[PDB]
Nucleic acid binder design. Structure first.
Length: 65
DNA sequence: ATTCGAATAT
DNA sequence: TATATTCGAA
């Protein structure tokens, strides 16, 4: 059946621990490299997708204003 | 080909 | 609102 990139995973709930992991990666990344693919790799979460990160990073950037 | 990201959808 | 998906741009 589906697998890897095509797996139809449930909605990602950003727990406080997951979010803190995200922030610690983004905060210490070169601003040039603070993009969803790089964030996704550095966060080291089996099953996290680049799209999960992009949507979360969008709101985060509004929060940082 | 790839992937970003604001806009939009659910 | 939080998270997902679209789609034009880089």
């Amino acid at each position: 059946g589906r697998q890897g990139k095509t797996l139809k995973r449930p909605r990602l709930v950003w727990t406080p621990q997951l979010h803190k992991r995200f922030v610690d990666v983004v905060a210490h990344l070169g601003i040039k490299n603070a993009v969803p693919k790089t964030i996704m790799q550095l966060m080291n979460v089996e099953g996290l997708t680049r799209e999960n990160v992009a949507s979360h990073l969008q709101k985060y950037r509004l929060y940082l204003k």
